[model samples]
Target: SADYEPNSWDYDFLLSSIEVYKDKAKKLEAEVRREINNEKAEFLTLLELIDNVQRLGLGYRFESDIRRALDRFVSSGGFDGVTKTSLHATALSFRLLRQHGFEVSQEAFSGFKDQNGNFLENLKEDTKAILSLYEASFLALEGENILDEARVFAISHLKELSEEKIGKELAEQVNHALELPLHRRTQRLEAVWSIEAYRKKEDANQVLLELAILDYNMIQSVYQRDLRETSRWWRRVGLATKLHFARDRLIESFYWAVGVAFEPQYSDCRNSVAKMFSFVTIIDDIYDVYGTLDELELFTDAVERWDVNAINDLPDYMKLCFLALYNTINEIAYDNLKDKGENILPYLTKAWADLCNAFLQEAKWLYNKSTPTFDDYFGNAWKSSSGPLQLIFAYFAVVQNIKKEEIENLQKYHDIISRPSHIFRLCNDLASASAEIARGETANSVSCYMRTKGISEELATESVMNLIDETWKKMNKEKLGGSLFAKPFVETAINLARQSHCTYHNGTSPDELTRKRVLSVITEPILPFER
Candidate 1:
């Protein structure tokens, strides 16, 4: 009875408006292309526009255009000549290039620093330069001393800037980025907020602004349909009512799916991911809240066996649980098999088995009152976070040409997947440690680090935060290298880390900051014609 009610979306109205505005957006896109080709500074402006469009969730529509634009810039050395003079231009170019997987060097930033390796003290007055530099700092990998120093230098100045007299919109942007780096924020949610930020710009293109608004609302309509269908499945499955102690969280799970892949084309992948995680949420509660040790063992065994015969060993609740998990996963695999002609049931089932085993291990540790070291906790924690399963599920659901080799590589737990997995685990632990401790949850990295090192809670927490930073460096390094997976798959891996940070950053259920921000994107539709 206390469950949150789903909101109304009026999908018919949104669908009707979607195409009308889509044609208008096409016209605007042509205008933007024509405008950018007209001036030297025009290309930088176009890059900024492209960057904002990507951030604003409209990039998919202009993918070929964006790729062509970036290709021209790279081939023509557009960024190379600019670094010597304008810090604003240089930092923006560096950030955009690095973000698009171009290997721009940090030495491009050397002009801003003195011989002593400190950023020139006088540049503090250059607010725009500092803001651009601050954002670019987050793209740094391990051992990039200049970017590291740049973050420190830029952050200190940005904090002072936030407190000082500045433009209202600029202050708002600073405060938002300070709350979390742009790299770590969820993309669609960022896009939702950025629609308003772009409107506030003095030179904001009305055409681009209108396109973002229409596109966001249109995407939300797709999400609503997905949520309605997923919610129907959840209700029919009857797990939420039967296992009432678990979080009745279809909306939250759907929200996460949106974060993972918000494009209109990935509706299938998004819906499947939402349903997959619904199972994950219920099963997580089985381990965290409901199951007795013996029952959990039986449930774990059933998953490992991947057979209905094994369900005979389970308790009634667990029998229902296992059946739901089994049927849902098989359904996903069956669809993939039918579509891609590959029997992926084994891979899908194995992921579930691995997740159950990881959960069982943590349950054992919690019950035995055993404190694992930081490494031990993180090793299991990453897998137990259920990220790998979700990522694998998304990969199979979306990718058309399902390569067995890529699947096998992922099954082997390659670094490409593992790096983002650790980042997801560590960011979750860092954010949720206090609440986890209060709830008497098992040894997270924070508590484990404390127990192993004999340090105070504050210091241990700081150490875990440091570990999170280290994990990001690793993820960045991996992102810059050649990968077996496609760029979108790789991007999904990174977005999972970003979503984890968004979900747990406040350390409580439906965190006000995260919830408030996400709800606006979910419910509010900014009018396309207004500004």
Candidate 2:
């Protein structure tokens, strides 16, 4: 017993010894295991069906089913390593099935049931499994797992399980109802990928559809608040929650999807996780810029407390409340390490750090807004210190999906925003030169105009164009305010402002309006619409 062991534990010894500890670690939440298992079986079945369908067609080849499972596993969640890959297999399997011809119904997927038929209302095996598989496929398509197999090996087992658990009648109902809505399956998934296409495929799963719309709405609103001077608390808080929830769901879906595929072969799951986290980084900034200081601070506290244990510690509603945040933290931490982030621990260390830093900066901005400086309350609004924060978050997102060169093209906007208001003042003065000249006021129209334009530009910079781009693209013709030019510009401007505010100020204490009045003459020359 005293002898030091050196590589002495053989596979059989380890296996034999491990048996004593089986089920030793108490489960944090019963749903963690139960939900994940159901998710796995669901994905396995869906993927197997997709594979069968594709094979039957004899084209559009895919990776083997086993490999797909592996990819999903790498991107999933759980407390221990065992449950971590909870939804990977399930996600891919769902994607495969959707690609073929199976629809998902809300009625069929609400909560879990006990042996005695008590409704748990939590995502049980039957429900989550199918959901995860669908979500996993989306992650995979986003290029999270660029290389993986696609045979799809889940149908037979799923068929057996569904029949056994759901029973013949209920299973038959599932089969029948889902089939009538067959075209909807592929259509809904396509909608997820495309805003316009998604709208076209109406009456999709309300949850998913709402999530997509909500994400875009909140992000876009934050962007707008960033660019202008009017303060609206309800708009900010409501939109902030919208963004917060949608983002949470998006990242969670990715984690669950990858969890389903947790296995030995699929290693690219980490990429999907990282990509989704990158999206969160941007949305977090929006809250900081547009939200109240108190709200931003609360959000920051929430960020600091993100994790499965934190989730477990929360009250049930709160557990659900922060489920998305918790999922994100675990997803990023685990995936980044899996992607060789261990060598750069500090970089990983700052993932949360980066989020908090941007978050707090916005709080400071909010504070400054509430208590204006002597000069600020007197003048019009100006884009303040929050600009750089916006640029940084935008930069992070861009680097994830696009090349550096393409991002470089966007560098000029950052450069313009980085400077203090003085630069914007100069640009404004340049535009209002004639206004000042005509006013016969002090030829100093330059300073007055600069202040005015700076406010406009700064506020303009706050809106989240990314969200607007996505949202407007999906809106019906009448809802979008008409003209082609108006649609793109409106959304683009919104995206810019949201990110700018979020990245720089955290929206809580935004920049104070530097009210200046030299407009009488300056306005006279500018007005009269070509009359």
Candidate 3:
């Protein structure tokens, strides 16, 4: 007892405990091995099956296996509900793939269809479901990096439901909604350019700006309606259960649109997106700074009634934001057209009146502001009477468009050659071209690069661009810009950076410090900073 022995306890008791633990350990080992073998086999089987399932393109064989797997997983579920359910679902997915002989490539699980194949015509729902599962597969494997590959993900479907395809589907519905008929409305949006005038800087600026604002409104209207239509369809299918997922995807689409819109390449798209934000900005002010929800509701109600008496119900702050938008729009419209001796001033007055009226009603009811509602906030009543006019005009002057969606879609349309990896090559080409123009390797920079580069003049002109560089350098200083805040803000800024690529000197905005700097640069090119 005084000296500590190596074997402090009796051997017999120790041996008994050891034996007990060994049995349990052995049992656990056996079970774990069994599971490993089973899961390994299941994975192989699933891989092969998915490959085969793809060829059939949504046939009975695939459907039957999928159903069987779902049934088995649901019935046999155990352990943590979320984990077990997900695991079993995954296993069942493998089982289906194995059954269908597509377990080999594992690519069929993605719902990718051959364009030439006839099977895709009727499998929209099935294909959508499979694509969702494929995304889940990535998530399960902890490969979140691939999740934003929009073409290969859920977002692709939403984009498909855009006006590009939707317009074709609802052509008759559209024809019925118009007064002069679809053809006449369509003609109103005709893209026209004269060769001589198109080459003139002033002419190009005038025409492009008009086209940009018009296109911005059109595209915004299209996308917003697409979200509503798709959401309605989901409810109709009893898939309203997935509303959150669908809504999130819609927001993702908006984010992508925002990214592309603010990028330098597509000024029109950028302005349109900015216009949406502008609406959001004012609504936010109305709700948070100005009007109570009840007051907003009352205001909206008054607007709906087109009664001037309801204006008093609006919260003073909402009245201010509404008035701000109303006055600025009129002021600009008047100044430009007044010079041409064509006074559009009366229309502007009515627009301000209409906007104020609508807000008064919404404030009365606290109608939660929405795009269409806000677009109509000042637009509908003012449409023919100098109408609400294009609110996107202010947005165009503020935001830049990057062309990511156009590039991404183009990349997807040629998937094999065009993953985001190819962005480098595209950047390289752009850089080379820019170098050529800068060094006078091409024609005059002002005419060709500044004017005809299919981007913003703000980006083309050296003065505005110098602003970005100076801002970057100033922010890069350690004391001026702290690393933490600066990094995210810088990254966010780059998303809005109109440049084709980032450079070492100003490759990325350093951080939040650049927000102030960028605001300065952007405001300069914009001519009038309405805010």
Candidate 4:
């Protein structure tokens, strides 16, 4: 319902708890800094703690300490000197270093495999070793066949063990990994589940546990405040209620923005992004569900012109949307102009125009009952999915300063920008094909490939899945190569792709698991520390 209320929590108390945990987490940080029990192994152990802190969503609390440790350890060639025979240790080291953007070699796992290119037969029974190997392998960039083999080998054993005798908790972990590898899982979602898993582990650190629980509560408090503002804007805009055909998903849209950049510092970016996404959602429904071809043509042209005068030409409903689009884009541009001394209307408007044009093209295909070739469809589908537009919006929000040249390159749809765009498109199609078809939509990648190549639907689906995997390789390579953007901005771009993957995993409709988990995190605050 458009009349839905914003989520509320007891923020004052949560904020107080946050301050308490913040101090304790810092004390733990000091301990790590002052003491190195075993210079060689302690640093590695420290790195593991850092990794856990990060994966648990508390790393932002110790950025300086974490980076300093990683730099000193990596530059000193710490991992290079350690001749570790244990698969668990070796794999964990490789994963952590590579994740920190280090150039760790896959040859680190050579000892575990035999001459025939198979993992040693005896290693199959060691669940910890296999599970660690499974996660580390996912950090593989393009062309790392060894890591690919590691993934396959680990999966085979993990699945086998899932069917055999195992501890209930261990089996649950195994099944979870098999369902979604750690590398691809959303960090916030991972942090939520991993907290419970960590508590069950025999060696769980009390400090780390307390800090993670407190940090999550604090972050949710922030998310709730932002949601109230977003919800207010959504209601004031009146698009959801007036345009009943559109998806009323203000909370869901904000969750996506959080997925893109979850840190406290990015709250403004998050709010603006939530607004942008909410706009995209309603606008998408206009093109997909409600607008007629004639009306869509008018709307697309109005967007392309990007002028207030165009509002007069639109229909009543279109005018409401067009004005909302105009005001929101201009308000964001105004913020940029006031804060960054650069006017961004040109880039932002062009992105919206491009998205509309793409949406219009799809409308044409659907109306004409046409199925374009995969190449033809994909060329526009990538943009039509609004991935480029969303990423561009993110670029403006997170990046400290903007340059005209980079904006121009982004406006031109540069290669680096398009890499993640294609990933978002393909993953969306793979996840939404069944529902789209059931809804009588005919322009998705699956249908386009099937029609163009004269292949079966099953084969077409497989091809799309393979394409998604290959796209990830490209994205991974881009991430490793340095870019002109800030690290946070680059990571947000990648995180959006991860969000897309997580979003579509449960199919076209919003996943029940996602909704429940998101609501749970928003409402639950870990107030009393558990022993």
As a TM-score, model 1 comes out at 0.92
Clashes of each: 0, 88, 55, 0
TM-scores of the candidates are 0.92, 0.23, 0.22, 0.91
Ranking by TM-score: 1, 4, 2, 3
Tens digit per residue, CA lDDT, model 3, 1-531: 474543212222322435654454334333422432343244434433333232212122134444444344335532114222332233335434333323222332333334542223333444334333433332121132222232244434433443454454333222222211111111111111111122333423342233223323333444455445544532343321322221122233233334433322234344333333334434434533466656656555543444444555555544444444444445545644654444444443443344454445434333443223322322221221111122213222332331334223322222211111122222333334455565643222222334444555346555323333333333223212333222322322223221222211122333442343233222212121111
Model 4 pairs in collision: none
Q: Give me the runs in candidate 1 sitting further than 4 Å from their true place.
A: 1-19, 36-43, 438-442, 507-510
Q: Which ten residues in a row have the lowest lDDT in candidate 1?
A: 6-15
Distance from true location, Cα of 454 in model 4, Å: 2.8
Question: What is candidate 4's lDDT per residue for 128-241, written digit by digit as tens?
Answer: 878889988877888899898998899888887854476888798888887777777777777888787787777888777776776687788788898888788889988888
Query: How well is each residue in 154-181 modelled by candidate 1, as lDDT tens digits?
Result: 8898888754577777788788888788
RMSD (Cα, Å) for all candidates, in order, is: 6.0, 24.6, 28.2, 5.9
**Candidate 2 ranges beyond 4 A from true positions:** 1-292, 302-323, 339-346, 367-531
Per-residue lDDT of candidate 2, residues 148-240 (tens digit): 111121222233447677766446534532322221222212222233233434443333333333333322232233212212322332333
